[PDB]
Paper text:
In Mononegavirales, the [name] (N protein, known as NP in Filoviridae) is an RNA-binding protein that encapsidates the viral RNA genome, with each protomer binding to nine nucleotides and forming a helical homo-oligomer nucleocapsid to encapsidate the entire single RNA strand. The [name] acts as a chaperone to keep the [name] soluble, prevent self-association, and to maintain it in a conformation ready for its addition to the newly synthesised viral RNA. In lyssaviruses, the interaction between [name] (N) and [name] (N) in the absence of RNA generates a complex (N0P) that is crucial for viral assembly, and understanding the interface between these two proteins has the potential to provide insight into a key feature: the viral lifecycle. In this study, we used recombinant chimeric protein expression and X-ray crystallography to determine the structure of ABLV [name] bound to residues 1–40 of its [name] chaperone.
Using a chimera of [name] residues 1–53 and full-length [name], we purified and crystallised the protein and solved the structure to 2.19 Å resolution. There was a single molecule of the N0P chimera in the asymmetric unit. Residues 27–447 of the [name] could be traced, except for a chain break between residues 352 and 399 that remained unresolved due to its being in a flexible loop. The structure of [name] contained the N-terminal and C-terminal globular domains that contained multiple alpha helices together with a central hinge region that resulted in it having the jaw-like structure typical of Mononegavirales nucleoproteins. The [name] chaperone module had good electron density and could be traced from residues 2 to 40. Its N-terminus appeared to be essentially unstructured and was followed by two helical domains (Helix 1 Pro8-Arg12 and Helix 2 Met20-Gln40) that were separated by an unstructured loop. The structure indicated that the interaction between the [name] and the [name] is mediated by 13 H-bonds and three salt bridges, with Helix 2 of the [name] being amphipathic and forming a large number of hydrophobic interactions within the binding groove of the [name]. The ABLV [name] chaperone Helix 2 occluded the RNA-binding site and interacted with RNA-binding residues Arg168, Arg149, and Arg225. [name] Arg12 forms two hydrogen bonds and a salt bridge with [name] Glu403, which would otherwise bind N-1 Arg357 and Arg361. Despite the two different approaches to generating the N0Ps, the ABLV and RABV crystal structures have a high similarity (RMS 0.69), giving confidence that the ABLV structure was unaffected by the engineered linker regions.
Numbering used by the authors: 59 to 97, 171 to 496, 544 to 591
Write the structure that this text describes.
């Protein structure tokens, strides 16, 4: 009525959407590939032909920097300014050949055949202020580190980004398993064992906030962007940096993953989004010029690289779409949706109503118009079967605060 629209009208007016299919395909494929490593709004497109940049202190001698940091790693005392400075200087050790011309947002990163490193992707300015480079456990001279040892330290340090991002209750056993697997990777060829078991977790306990240090996040995204494009001997370093891909794009990513889950084209799936507020949010996600369908674009790491502070692709940015997708997920009994956080300011009651009808529509693997018809025939209200299912899934779950499951328990019971 005044809240919902006939999908026949959405079918006429959503044909302007651009590269929506290609975007869904690329993002879903990238998410799939990333699994091997895992186990007011400002659009990101660069307009001035300058690479992303940060500022660090004066470049250190790599061998001296390695020895200082490895000593800090064993003592669970790392200086984050020194670690960033070392990580940026270590980029020169990760050299490959660009397999094809690499351009993003009008910036020619490299031409086919160019020798490139992660430093090619960004402008890292440096002051003339020396880092601290303190060493403990005795200042006795030690053998110079090999490249493989540098690669292990780089990988271990960068994994503190991923470990820092993991936070919340009932997450430290998962954190323990992740830490253990990361340690194993970086003590297994082509990497070298440079620390004893359980050192990473002890270090992370003192570095738990590092994911909120912008320069460190920036460096993690730079390495991840580089290893995504350039196959490299030490590419497994992405076990720590893969989490920078599509950061703060949980609305767009929920949308693309939702389209794949219901096995529809983006053109057809959009027809089911027939609540009036969806249109603005859907056009927000497919704004032209952002390279959402371009492989290896800066777009994939735009949040970590500082291209935008207010993502148009976040769950809040498209809260109605996001709420709807995860109420459907709740109806389907998907834990990821039950524990997701509701966008309180995006009509979670109406999204839960449409979610119940769509959940019923797709349960167990029919047209958008039929669904619209059923909702209207019930006066825009959930049926008792819907509510029973919603309660069945939520009352039988450990509803987290502000989660979709908690919303269902308080709203339907």
């Amino acid at each position: 009525s005044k809240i919902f629209v006939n999908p026949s009208a959405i079918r006429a007016g959503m044909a302007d959407l651009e590269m929506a299919e290609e975007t869904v395909d690329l993002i879903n494929r990238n998410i799939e590939d990333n699994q091997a490593h895992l186990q007011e709004y400002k659009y990101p497109a660069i307009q001035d032909h300058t690479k992303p940049s940060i500022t660090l202190g004066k470049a250190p001698d790599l061998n001296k920097a390695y020895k200082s940091i490895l000593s800090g790693m064993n003592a669970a005392k790392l200086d984050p300014d020194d670690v960033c400075s070392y990580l940026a200087a270590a980029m020169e050790l990760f050299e490959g050949v660009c397999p094809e011309d690499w351009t993003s947002y009008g910036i020619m990163i490299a031409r086919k055949g160019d020798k490139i490193t992660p430093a090619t992707l960004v402008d890292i300015k440096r002051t003339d202020i020396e880092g601290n480079w303190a060493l403990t456990g005795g200042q006795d001279l030690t053998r110079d580190p090999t490249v493989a040892e540098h690669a292990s330290l780089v990988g271990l340090l960068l994994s503190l980004y991923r470990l820092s991002k993991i936070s919340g209750q009932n997450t430290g056993n998962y954190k323990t398993n992740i830490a253990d697997r990361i340690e194993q990777i970086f003590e297994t060829a082509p990497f070298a064992k440079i620390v004893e078991h359980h050192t990473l977790m002890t270090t992370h306990k003192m570095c738990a906030n590092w994911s909120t240090i912008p320069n460190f996040r920036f460096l993690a995204g730079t390495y991840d962007m580089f290893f995504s494009r350039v196959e490299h001997l030490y590419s497994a370093i992405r076990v720590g940096t893969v989490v920078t891909a599509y950061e703060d794009c949980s609305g767009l990513v929920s949308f693309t993953g939702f389209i794949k889950q219901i096995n529809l084209t983006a053109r057809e799936a959009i027809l089911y989004f027939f609540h009036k507020n969806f249109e603005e949010e859907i056009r927000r996600m497919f704004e032209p010029g952002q390279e959402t369908a371009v492989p290896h674009s800066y777009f994939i790491h735009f949040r970590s690289l500082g291209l935008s502070g207010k993502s148009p692709y976040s769950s809040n940015a498209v809260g109605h779409v996001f709420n709807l997708i995860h109420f459907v997920g709740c109806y389907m009994g998907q834990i990821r949706s039950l524990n997701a956080t509701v966008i309180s300011t995006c009509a979670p009651h109406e999204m839960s109503v449409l979610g119940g009808y769509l959940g019923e529509e797709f349960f167990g693997k029919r047209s958008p118009e039929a669904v619209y018809t059923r909702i209207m025939m019930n006066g825009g209200r959930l049926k008792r079967s819907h509510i029973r299912r919603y309660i069945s899934v939520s009352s039988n779950h450990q509803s987290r605060p502000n989660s979709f499951a908690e919303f269902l328990n308080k709203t339907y019971s």
